[PDB]
Amino acid sequence: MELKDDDFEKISELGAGVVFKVSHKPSGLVMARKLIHLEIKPAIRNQIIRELQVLHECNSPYIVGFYGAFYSDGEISICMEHMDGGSLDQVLKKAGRIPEQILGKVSIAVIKGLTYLREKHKIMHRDVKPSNILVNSRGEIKLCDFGVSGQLIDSMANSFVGTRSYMSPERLQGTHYSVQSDIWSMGLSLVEMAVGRYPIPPPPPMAIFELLDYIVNEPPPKLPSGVFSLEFQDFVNKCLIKNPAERADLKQLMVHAFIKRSDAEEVDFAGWLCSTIG
């Protein structure tokens, strides 16, 4: 859309991991602006930008909108649709835990967005988790921050950073990345949002490396025994099977009992959202 740092103006801050809510003055648009700082050769930087341009060709109700990416002052700027609901990670804070009928809708949203990305663009997400699922007051649930640029992925070296990991056992044992890996993350995210806390380990903090080792060695987490329907339980369990061959695939999940039910349920998500978030 041709954006430059002069066009913009900060309204507020939305969070970091940093992202501002900005006004794009020349067009009137309100956008979310992510700044990524990288100490990198100018040459690869331009390649990231070049590669982000693919986002202009994404068009799914399950995928956050993209306005453009550019470089300025040692910052990569990625400009996006502003989601006034924030991430399910933020929502999870305010709510303590998210009800399984809401998670049913989330699951459908995620499953659809993954399948759209994989089929129309042959790309995997690579980073499915509560903070990358965004919601808004129209009740929409959308995926964000997927691995669109191979250079950006390589430059960020995300596998070793942060306190939680949603990486799969195969990948941590040298397997190529595939869709089955995003399924594990979604299952892992669903359990986190259902019980109110990152499920690894089951209930001194683990640093990233003990965590990763735990993931490849210990049995997968599961939902507690009475609070949740058996259909939800089984769904999450099919997502968290350590052997990717055995783990369910998108087609299978899409016809699972839990999803067929959830798809039928009348949930007023925007309503629940706004009387949980404000």
Ligand X SMILES: Nc1ncnc2c1ncn2[C@@H]1O[C@H](COP(=O)(O)OP(=O)(O)NP(=O)(O)O)[C@@H](O)[C@H]1O
Ligand Y SMILES: CNS(=O)(=O)Nc1nccc(Cc2c(C)c3ccc(Oc4ncccn4)cc3oc2=O)c1F
Q: Which residues are catalytic?
A: 127
152 binds, among Cl ion, Mg ion, ligand Y, none (CB under 5 to 8 A by kind): ligand Y
Residue 133 or 259: which CB sits closer to ligand Y? 133
Q: Cα-Cα-Cα-Cα dihedral of 215, 218, 219, 221, to 10°? A: -50
What is the C-alpha end-to-end distance of the chain, expressed in Å? 32
> Residues 71-90: x/- map of binding to ligand Y (CB under 6 A)?
-------x-x----------
**Can you tell me the distance from the alpha carbon of 3 to that of 57, in angstroms, rounded to the nearest whole number?**
17
- Looking at residue 29, its amino acid is L
| 276 belongs to the binding site for ligand Y (CB under 6 A) | no
147 is in an annotated binding site: yes
| 60 belongs to the binding site for ligand Y (CB under 6 A) | no
**Can you tell me the distance from the alpha carbon of 116 to that of 149, in angstroms, rounded to the nearest whole number?**
17
32 binds, among Mg ion, ligand X, Cl ion, none (CB under 5 to 8 A by kind): ligand X
| 132 belongs to the binding site for ligand X (CB under 6 A) | yes
Beta bridge partners of 71: 76
Q: Which two tokens stand for residue 257?
A: 């009992």
**Can you tell me the distance from the alpha carbon of 67 to that of 7, in angstroms, rounded to the nearest whole number?**
13
| 211 belongs to the binding site for ligand Y (CB under 6 A) | no
**Can you tell me the distance from the alpha carbon of 242 to that of 85, in angstroms, rounded to the nearest whole number?**
33
Q: Which region among 47-55, 70-78, 101-109, 131-139 touches Cl ion (by CB under 5 A)? A: 131-139
| 80 belongs to the binding site for ligand X (CB under 6 A) | yes
State the minimum distance, in angstroms, from the CB of residue 226 to ligand X: 31
24 is in an annotated binding site: no
* Contact criterion met (CB below 8 Å) for 39 and 142: no
Q: Cα-Cα-Cα-Cα dihedral of 13, 18, 70, 25, to 10°? A: 0
Residue 60 or 178: which CB sits closer to Cl ion? 178
159 binds, among Cl ion, Mg ion, ligand Y, none (CB under 5 to 8 A by kind): ligand Y
Q: Cα-Cα-Cα-Cα dihedral of 109, 111, 115, 118, to 10°? A: 110
Among residues 64, 106, 223, 240, the one that binds ligand X under rule CB under 6 A: 64
Where is the binding site, in residues?
A: 14-19, 34, 80-83, 87-90, 129-132, 145-148
Positions in the binding site for ligand Y (CB under 6 A): 34, 52, 55, 63-64, 66, 78, 80, 126-127, 144-149, 152-153, 156, 158-159
